[PDB]
Amino acid sequence: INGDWNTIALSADNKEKIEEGGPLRVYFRQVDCNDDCSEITFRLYVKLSGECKESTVIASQTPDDFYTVQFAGENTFLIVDKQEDLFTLYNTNVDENGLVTRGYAIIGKRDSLTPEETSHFEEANELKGIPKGNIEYLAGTDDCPER
């Protein structure tokens, strides 16, 4: 499931991590899977201190279909959904200070969700404790490059 992808929306119980400036407000660029997807390489940008910080990271599949990646702390995410033009993740981020920020991340080829996909995502968030308000839609706020 390789290619050039875009972050459509992000969510977090601690919204600050995905707000403009937070380390988890991640605008994706590439999601390259290996042969059996036991490792996924992610090229992505994060606006931090007014800088578009590029990162290229590997997420390895544990023996339980979960994925561990080091990025702004220890992260453990599952692929909650996977369609032809979209896919969602539910990550548990443990930053340097031990704060556990759990949340969702929709990544796809388009820049926005349909009305049906939107309500479904809102339900999934409130269901997993995250409020409807703690959902940032990164559409139109991607002022980073591909260098």
Interrupted after residues, the chain (C–N over 2.5 Å): none
CA atoms within 13 A on the CB side of 29: 16
| Nearest to 8, CA basis, from 146, 141, 137 | 137
**3-class secondary-structure state, position 63:** coil
CA distances from 66 to 45, 99, 137, 147 (A): 23, 20, 25, 30
Q: Is the dihedral of CA 112, 115, 118, 124 positive or negative?
A: negative
Query: Could you give the CA distance from residue 97 to residue 100 in angstroms, rounded to a whole number?
Result: 9
Cβ neighbours for 115, distance < 8 A, ≥ 6 positions apart: none
